Design an enzyme around this catalytic site. Structure first.
Site, PDB file in Angstrom:
ATOM      1  N   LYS A 218      -0.693  -6.047  -7.018  1.00 54.53           N
ATOM      2  CA  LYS A 218      -1.630  -5.171  -6.112  1.00 54.53           C
ATOM      3  C   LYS A 218      -0.829  -3.523  -6.123  1.00 54.53           C
ATOM      4  O   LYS A 218       0.407  -3.753  -6.001  1.00 54.53           O
ATOM      5  CB  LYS A 218      -1.758  -5.697  -4.757  1.00 54.53           C
TER       6      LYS A 218
ATOM      7  N   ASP B 295      -0.618 -18.826   0.504  1.00 60.74           N
ATOM      8  CA  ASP B 295      -0.820 -17.965   1.393  1.00 60.74           C
ATOM      9  C   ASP B 295      -0.602 -18.639   2.792  1.00 60.74           C
ATOM     10  O   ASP B 295      -0.404 -19.903   2.850  1.00 60.74           O
ATOM     11  CB  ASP B 295      -2.449 -17.726   1.239  1.00 60.74           C
TER      12      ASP B 295
ATOM     13  N   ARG C 297      -1.344   0.222  -4.673  1.00 62.30           N
ATOM     14  CA  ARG C 297      -2.058   1.499  -4.102  1.00 62.30           C
ATOM     15  C   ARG C 297      -0.635   2.474  -3.733  1.00 62.30           C
ATOM     16  O   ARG C 297       0.059   1.942  -2.907  1.00 62.30           O
ATOM     17  CB  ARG C 297      -2.735   1.046  -2.986  1.00 62.30           C
TER      18      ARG C 297
ATOM     19  N   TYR D 247      -8.204  15.719  -1.886  1.00 64.15           N
ATOM     20  CA  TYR D 247      -8.875  14.649  -0.912  1.00 64.15           C
ATOM     21  C   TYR D 247      -9.416  15.199   0.388  1.00 64.15           C
ATOM     22  O   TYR D 247      -8.556  16.047   1.127  1.00 64.15           O
ATOM     23  CB  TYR D 247      -7.463  13.889  -0.625  1.00 64.15           C
TER      24      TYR D 247
ATOM     25  N   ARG E  57      -2.646 -18.234   5.306  1.00 64.11           N
ATOM     26  CA  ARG E  57      -3.866 -18.287   5.849  1.00 64.11           C
ATOM     27  C   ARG E  57      -4.603 -19.530   4.936  1.00 64.11           C
ATOM     28  O   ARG E  57      -4.136 -19.698   3.810  1.00 64.11           O
ATOM     29  CB  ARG E  57      -4.709 -17.123   5.619  1.00 64.11           C
TER      30      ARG E  57
ATOM     31  N   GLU F  61      -6.795   1.819  -4.694  1.00 61.20           N
ATOM     32  CA  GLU F  61      -6.294   0.701  -5.330  1.00 61.20           C
ATOM     33  C   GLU F  61      -6.601   0.189  -6.633  1.00 61.20           C
ATOM     34  O   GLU F  61      -7.529   0.374  -6.904  1.00 61.20           O
ATOM     35  CB  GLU F  61      -6.380  -0.492  -4.216  1.00 61.20           C
TER      36      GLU F  61
ATOM     37  N   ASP G 188       1.211  12.524   2.579  1.00 63.15           N
ATOM     38  CA  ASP G 188       1.549  12.787   3.791  1.00 63.15           C
ATOM     39  C   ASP G 188       2.311  11.845   4.621  1.00 63.15           C
ATOM     40  O   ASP G 188       2.761  12.126   5.833  1.00 63.15           O
ATOM     41  CB  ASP G 188       0.104  13.433   4.516  1.00 63.15           C
TER      42      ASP G 188
ATOM     43  N   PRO H  15       1.523   5.013  -1.779  1.00 61.90           N
ATOM     44  CA  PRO H  15       1.523   5.425  -0.452  1.00 61.90           C
ATOM     45  C   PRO H  15       0.943   7.086  -0.470  1.00 61.90           C
ATOM     46  O   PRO H  15       1.206   7.579  -1.275  1.00 61.90           O
ATOM     47  CB  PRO H  15       3.097   5.406  -0.126  1.00 61.90           C
TER      48      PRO H  15
END
Ligand code: M7G
Ligand code: M7G
Ligand code: SAH
Ligand code: SAH
EC number: 2.1.1.57
Lengths: 291, 291
Positions: B169, B95, B171, B22, B97, B201, B176, B173
């Site tokens: 969902k 949600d 992704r 990376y 929102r 993700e 580092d 961690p």
């Protein structure tokens, strides 16, 4: 007299082939007939579990982390048994209560006086590293709220300790005191000879392959089943005299104990399984001071 | 130009056959090339997931509980697609929102403005009962601490809602910024065309058989792998022009989109898979106002 002929005893929950409506009046009946019956109950279950791991070659070199171990009198027998068989094991007994002094002075056994929390589990994990961990849990708080909390802690024990195998205390909350559905680890529901007369407690035995952890949901309908199958086992089965069982004692619990003990490894060579078992039982009873 | 010939695209994480160290400088590169690319990303993934459930016959009659749904513009397309196919589904979008007004006025879709907590999940479960639930989660808090908390909530979503399938969902961690090993549900790690340029993700797709729930531990070594496989996919693969892909657009993401769209069911009968896909893509792009 209550006589019957049986091939084998019910070794696991799923084998129970009948059920009975739980009678609350059973709670007033004599829970125990033998002195130190509780240490005997634990000793046979853990000997059964550990001998299995030996059979699968996962015991030697492991650290057995036993949470809820005190007083732990019967644990001295387990330790001597594998120690004398040449199996290399470290024992780490943790409880807030004090252990039986017979456990002191053994370099292979560490006694810890601590009430474990998720954070402490993390430190011991960091400290045991990189040894393979075998978890045995017998923690006790009970309400259904106390139980759920205990079970929730046992699951965190497995996630943090990440053991290669585990034996967990397992008694389903009673249907009339249901609070919510929850998850327990997947394992064999080992039945317990010499459990209290009307106990619905068993031990959950699991071996962890891969990096996966499989759980199973427990609902109130499951709770009703547990209650009825266990009540049938306790009231009916455990009260049978297995007459086709030629053994010094023919009561169901001895018949059931025989099947667990026949799986145990010994240094001494015996001419028959019956001779090994009688030997193991005599030995176990003498150690526990049971007549 | 960056040309190549590919048979199929990487559909799942495990298919990625290479890795790259990376390069943090990638964080400064253009994350998106298409307007509303994020709605397109979600639309293709959820169309892929839901079409699978239809194929397995578990979609019709279900209630799709989508947590973290706002604005949800692309969800209107999904709803119309299955609605027009005759599949009977109720949508419950939750949600804190607000949702796109295009979602209002549909009797089959309930919009909820609430930030879900474990307790609320319990009430909605009690209220959806006895419908079969399909969970889709796209909640967003990020630190590794925010992530773990999100993942912890997604697992509680499955335990309380007890869905027949779920899209989560996912992704990992970054190595580092590791904090602690944790568990995610077992499922297929679906890769996402049109994800941001250097996104790590993917979506975790699971179908729940029996009453069991299988999890899987994620460690820092897993985190290193995720980082390297995804970086290789993003930097190298996704930047390829698949010349043996006769299609209006040959870029990898369109090649990858083609394989997801070819699994989608339509009312209209087409002479070739290529014709159905072009149709579905034109349709999707027109809906999202993507040129
Ligand atoms: C076996 N059993 C026991 N109880 C209750 O549990 C109380 C304690 O007995 P126990 O069940 O042996 O306690 P424990 O599981 O903590 O070791 C009794 O006084 C009963 O009120 C029970 N209550 C219900 N509803 N159903 C059961 O099967 C049942
Ligand atoms: C893909 N990636 C992104 N970052 C960091 O993540 C930050 C935000 O970019 P992002 O990863 O797209 O955020 P998200 O996952 O919340 O959607 C960047 O500015 C980088 O510092 C990354 N940091 C590390 N160590 N490794 C990665 O693979 C990596
Ligand atoms: N968090 C915790 N850490 C350690 N032990 C725990 C615990 N919470 C409860 N316990 C312990 O769980 C035990 C249940 S009784 C256990 C009997 C024991 N297994 C035997 O071999 O003799 C009690 O001694 C109690 O102190
Ligand atoms: N506890 C919670 N309950 C509901 N939504 C949550 C949540 N915590 C965060 N979120 C939501 O997670 C969302 C992530 S962005 C989601 C985009 C959306 N899936 C799309 O279809 O457009 C935000 O709208 C945020 O409010």
């Amino acid at each position: 007299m209550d006589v019957v002929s049986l091939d084998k005893p019910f070794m696991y929950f799923e084998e129970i082939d009948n059920e009975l409506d739980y009678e609350p009046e059973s709670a007033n009946e004599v829970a125990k007939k033998l002195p130190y019956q509780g240490q005997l109950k634990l000793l046979l279950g853990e000997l059964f579990f550990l001998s299995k791991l030996q059979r699968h070659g996962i015991l030697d070199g492991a650290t057995v982390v036993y949470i809820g171990s005190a007083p732990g009198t019967h644990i001295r027998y387990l330790r001597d048994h594998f120690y004398n068989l040449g199996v290399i094991i470290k024992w780490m007994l943790i409880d807030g209560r004090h252990h039986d002094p017979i456990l002191n002075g053994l370099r292979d056994v560490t006694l810890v006086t601590r009430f474990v929390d998720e954070e402490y589990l993390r430190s011991i994990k960091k400290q045991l590293h990189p040894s393979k961990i075998i978890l045995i849990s017998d923690v006790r708080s009970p309400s259904t709220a106390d139980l759920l909390s205990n079970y929730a802690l046992q699951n965190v024990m497995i996630s943090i300790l990440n053991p290669v195998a585990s034996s967990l205390k397992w008694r389903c909350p009673f249907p009339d005191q249901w609070i919510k559905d929850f998850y327990i680890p997947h394992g064999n529901k080992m039945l317990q000879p010499f459990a209290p007369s009307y106990s619905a407690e068993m031990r959950l035995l699991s071996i962890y392959t891969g990096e996966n952890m499989r759980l199973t949901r427990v609902t109130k309908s499951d709770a009703v089943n547990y209650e009825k199958k266990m009540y049938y086992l306790n009231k009916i089965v455990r009260n049978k005299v297995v007459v086709n069982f030629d053994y010094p004692n023919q009561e169901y619990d001895y018949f059931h104990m025989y099947f667990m003990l026949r799986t145990v490894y010994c240094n001494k060579t015996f001419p028959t399984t019956k001779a090994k078992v009688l030997f193991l039982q005599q030995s176990i009873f003498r150690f526990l001071n049971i007549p």
